[PDB]
Design a protein around this ligand. Structure first.
Ligand SMILES: OC[C@H]1O[C@@H](O[C@H]2[C@H](O)[C@@H](O)[C@H](O)O[C@@H]2CO)[C@H](O)[C@@H](O)[C@H]1O
Ligand SMILES: OC[C@H]1O[C@@H](O[C@H]2[C@H](O)[C@@H](O)[C@H](O)O[C@@H]2CO)[C@H](O)[C@@H](O)[C@H]1O
Lengths: 137, 137
């Protein structure tokens, strides 16, 4: 297992992929969460270019935190995750948006609000175990 | 550190105290959560006589899950928890309600919806480290 909360320095550009493999810690019935935050600095309270929060079995919430303020919330009811199963997230950094694949198919998209070049850290946390975290070279 | 998610068999009656000492895993600014669920059986998807969920720095939500259905949600804006600090929760089982103390003072109350004698398990989970879990004898 990798450390959770998991915090890493990153550098991203168009064409980068952030791969995350993990497993929910508890039954979906109890709504475990997963959160992935693309931050502008190493500090945890720094701004967030992409906030991706899964309410397993319920919904997905996406947003940005700009100058310490949460902006317009984006919601999805797509729930391709499977109770108890390991999942593989691939967050593709496209020219216009982040695209979040689950097990190789895109389910969530978030247009860039902050330039991708401002992202310097990614934190993965909440109710998962983590077996892989990789930023493409 | 104790295991988180933390799941224990319990037996409660009027006068029992459930003591929980722990620390949030991340900055309050990012809204770590704490959840404490008093269950009717050892299985995680069993009914919940008392669901206590702290959205650190934001609010507290309380409810019951009866025959697999969430009931009427109770909210509190009391937020005595301190960013980064260890806290001590004491959940007192009173005749009429659960009373949740934080560092020795009561801030939250939840009238019994299920008999206390139906509780057989307590689970403590989400974004905390756990150093103490004790049910009074
Ligand atoms: O939008 C991401 C942001 O949400 C905050 O909580 C929201 C919640 O998602 C929404 O349903 C509710 O109506 O309003 C809240 C805003 O106060 C979280 O506090 C924050 O951590 C992010 O998750
Ligand atoms: O009430 C406890 C229950 O809440 C569910 O989520 C609620 C949420 O708190 C409320 O603000 C929103 O408006 O409605 C939701 C009900 O669908 C959680 O899903 C559940 O896990 C418990 O936390």
């Amino acid at each position: 297992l990798l450390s959770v909360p998991h915090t890493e320095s990153v550098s991203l550009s168009t064409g980068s992929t952030v791969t995350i493999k993990g497993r929910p810690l508890v039954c979906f019935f109890n709504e475990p969460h997963l959160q992935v935050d693309f931050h502008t600095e190493m500090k945890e309270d720094s701004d967030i270019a992409f906030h991706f929060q899964v309410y397993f079995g319920n919904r997905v919430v996406m947003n940005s935190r700009e100058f310490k303020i949460w902006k317009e919330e984006v919601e999805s009811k797509n729930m391709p995750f499977q109770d108890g199963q390991e999942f593989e997230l691939s967050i593709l950094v496209l020219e216009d948006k982040y695209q979040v694949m689950v097990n190789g198919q895109a389910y969530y998209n978030f247009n860039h609000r902050i330039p991708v070049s401002s992202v310097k850290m990614v934190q993965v946390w909440r109710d998962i175990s983590l077996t892989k975290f990789n930023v493409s070279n």
